[PDB]
Symmetry: D2
């Protein structure tokens, strides 16, 4: 056999350091121990290992936090489609129990939480044809369906609030911004199933720099005809979110998806020279040079994540991953959170 071929293929290797962990998956001969099955993800490899790390990182944020400021300010960011899905429930649970500090989402992420209190969203199919659905006034969101009557109901609900918002702006001197508006709609919806109802109630601010890119925008638009003058300033909200990072004792970032939401949170944390913890769950890829698809390491070069931080990115659909992450982290510390509130 060719010598060089043998040498190339049969190259010797010294052993790895003792610290090395072996790949090993959950053994179902033990039966189904869900906690152990989930912990086994850590040694399963690929994205399973990253999920395992995300659980450790989020648990570290929480532990730091349990040591109005807290020991660690957690920013929770998500894209609109996640509020359309059932992840809306998971997010509402975290906010209801004051487990995160700052929320930032896109317009869809705001409006659809309120609308779900008015009418439901349904399961559909990715394959459903647009023409046929439009003839029925049904809007398609992935494999989910939002009947357009939902937005008609949203309009009926919202208009009276916009009348009052412009009145208050003009007679009471109110300076409206996306966060102030979102807090208002949250108080107005007055429904325990609402993310913003709870955020408003727990004084957790919600940032959304492009609040006008959606249904709420359409309503603001039409309403501006009979009642012109409403102003939504994005500058004041910039100061608010940035100062939360700046004066935080320590920060963690839990970001689902990419775009403005992801970038906006990481830019705020650059103001303090980087977040101390960062966990991402998104399906974007880096090859196109997009910010949305950038590995957490690129954020390190910008100084948005501390050079000594251990950021984790899980490549996967959050609808699948987020509830499992919450089950193994926040949900496992309910007593600790309550204890901090004097309820345990």
């Amino acid at each position: 056999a060719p010598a060089g071929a043998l040498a190339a293929v049969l190259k010797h290797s010294s052993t790895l350091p003792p610290e090395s962990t072996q790949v090993r998956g959950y053994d179902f001969n033990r039966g189904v121990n869900y906690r152990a099955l989930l912990e086994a993800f850590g040694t399963t490899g690929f994205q399973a290992t990253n999920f395992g790390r995300a659980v450790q990182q989020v648990n570290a944020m929480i532990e730091k936090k349990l040591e109005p400021l807290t020991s660690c300010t957690i920013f929770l960011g998500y894209t609109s489609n996640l509020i359309s899905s059932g992840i809306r429930e998971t997010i509402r649970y975290l906010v209801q129990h004051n487990m995160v500090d700052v929320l930032v989402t896109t317009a869809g992420g705001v409006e659809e939480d309120l609308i779900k209190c008015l009418a439901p969203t349904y399961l559909g199919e990715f394959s459903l044809r647009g023409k046929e659905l439009r003839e029925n006034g049904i809007n398609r969101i992935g494999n989910l369906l939002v009947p357009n009557e939902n937005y008609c109901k949203f309009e009926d609900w919202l208009m009276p609030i916009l009348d009052q918002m412009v009145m208050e702006q003009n007679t009471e001197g109110v300076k409206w911004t996306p966060s102030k508006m979102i807090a208002r709609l949250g108080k107005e919806i007055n429904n325990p199933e609402s993310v913003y109802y709870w955020a408003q109630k727990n004084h957790i601010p919600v940032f959304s720099p492009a609040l006008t890119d959606g249904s709420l925008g359409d309503m603001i638009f039409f309403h501006s005809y009979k009642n012109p003058g409403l102003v939504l300033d994005i500058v004041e909200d910039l100061r608010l979110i940035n100062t939360q990072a700046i004066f935080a004792k320590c920060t963690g970032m839990i970001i689902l998806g990419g775009g403005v939401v992801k970038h906006h949170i990481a830019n705020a944390n650059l103001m303090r020279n980087g977040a101390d913890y960062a966990v991402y769950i998104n399906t974007a890829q880096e090859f196109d040079g997009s910010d949305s698809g950038a590995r957490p390491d690129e954020a390190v070069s910008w100084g948005k994540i501390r050079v000594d931080a251990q950021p984790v990115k899980v490549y996967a659909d959050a609808s699948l991953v987020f509830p499992l992450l919450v089950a193994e982290t926040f949900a496992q510390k309910m007593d600790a959170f309550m204890h901090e509130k004097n309820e345990d």
Copy 2:
């Protein structure tokens, strides 16, 4: 041989309709006829066929347009990373020659066009480690590099302009919005290599609902300490972009990337019950239910693309695709555009 196996595998088929086109790629035995090679993409299959269709669709927008209003209002949308790349040149060419009507981009998409007039962006690698780059103050964007000194220069350049913007707001009654600001910075940069210099000059509006999510935002933030009060209203800009769709004789949408940009343009066109032409070039996928990754058909269900329109989506990095699309469309009609301006 098993009968049912034979029947299943050897199932007969009638012939396809005469209208059917055969798959066939460019024959290099002809040598290199670039125009024919590009036209051959149409019958090559997969994304090549979609690129071929995108060329036909954009050419249709242009032809309709050549028949202050024009016969077809073209909205050009792009994400920030594309202005970081050399596609910034392609976009500036289209705007310089008044070939598109409305532009919408994200914050990075605005600021980096101006900054490139102050200092350049360089080629780097996706692999460059964040820690090492940060120790040098180098920001990484995909396989591109933006030295942080660039933003320091941006700050020196921008501050005087922000002083004047707040002065004008307070003594001259100016109501600032993202588009008005972008037009101002474009006039200020006064450089022929600037996209916004040309947009401002050709009265092509630029929308950017989250103009604060970036460097310009950081500068607005810091500046607000010595000179507080600047207001950036996103509501008035909503009326402006929506009315462009509403009063357009016909519309076309050329969108690179996804996120707010893509959604914002399609929402404006819903105001006229859908765009007449739509071409997309992005790398997002639909499985995660994201708006960014939605096939053009989902937009049809919302009524953002006319049910009778033939939208085209090319799955590919625009840095590769866009210059070829411009070469085969707009660049092929320079004389026609000039003719409309009485220069031919």
Copy 3:
């Protein structure tokens, strides 16, 4: 407000049919009921809903099966990297308990199961540089590491077996094929942690048309110098796998990943005019026209999946998804499987 704008945006919609299911995620206020949390994936939307469907489809295969033939022949296919990961354990569990009928994997999928009985694979990082690792003789597989000494040990282990295989071929008339070889190596490894040890023991055939594309191939190659003549025929294995589909009472397909494995299983089922059940878990996309990235519906056009079947594709990394699918399906029916074997 513009009339047509209002009409377009405020289009009415009738209600959806009563059969419609509402999107709703798990409510953590209930605490952590893992079974309910997993069942809630079904109404969470996006890939979570598809995972929910995959569980229902696999449970249907199993139920049909529990009604040497069985009521439903399940083909289990997987790519090499999944045997490198801890999913190797999940697969071995299914095979150990005779829960699937036919296995098909690539070369890596065969050899690495045997090698893990000789030396372990470790956790590494996607970021580890190739040059540095090669200087140490460490092979990188995603975020996993395979020290090259592992293959040296594999060679020491395999050579004696290859000597015997060629002897038997030449003096005992044995006609070697990939499946016969894999069964032999499985018997030889004689380790309860081995997938092929169990397959061989439970008479579950393993197909691998390109068994030579890997380490086993390198060893076959070098060995052919001192002991030439070994023949591995891929034709006989074709008859074997095809006849399993043809004479099956009913079939189900559980495929992880794409490529040859996925295509080979679906082609065998075309021989019976399509599989009755099909569940896929892979991360491939359809835009490039690849077979690996084709939606299950394309398989329907070929007649590889029955037109009346309800195939499910989950877009996600199987290292994350497969153990959860097994927990909710096969692992929940251990007693039923044992009952069929007279052990309950």
Copy 4:
């Protein structure tokens, strides 16, 4: 303004080294100079820059080659769907003019080249429903269509050849392997539009370890009933491809797509301790730990690409990219290739 905030954001940076290249895209004010537009991809960034590098790397392989052995043995690998597309023409052009040395493809990649000489493939849509198409006996491949009558014609064409192949095996002692078979079918098809007709004619071997995974396999299967005994050995083909790498003066790898094809070529080059040049064009991602989605650097850790080589991976659909790469490389050196053959 907060000091630490200013320090973090306004961090100074020294200038980059003089060797740094600036990002800059093609300026269409020059008109359309296709050669310059393509060369400009190099400084455009993202995948455009990688395409630019792929052109330089392939040109280096060719230059080395122009210095039966040649100075550089080029392995050309591609997946089946690319032969279904018009890229079949591009590949046939390279083979017709003896520009590559070894070809390796999957089963579909072999059979569909032959079938296209019998009947054409057509343009369809990704959206075409499987049920409807199957009722018509039309097979769907991405946005392409293959009428099933094509395979019926393939069967009529192939059977006589298989009768002879088994006759020759049994009376003339022929030992069949995938490469020997493919050479035979190539000679048999006797059509200048056939890739394998030209490969056979130019003595360019074609490897395909899973030649049975497709239509040719179905035909081999059915034929084995009346004429049993045909043997296709994959071991001898292993020696052939490996020795091409081993005894090559220098090697280059041009791989389109992933899977067996990609892995098989890189494994052969490991026999010589790595390929000297490597260019890849595929859409696979690394996150799932797949070999198909591995960055070229992982191949370096295995020693399949020389540690001192500059491999290039372009993330994009090859139907779009490959013809442009050939236009800028091989097609630009036709005279040089002919010169080496004494035709110039």
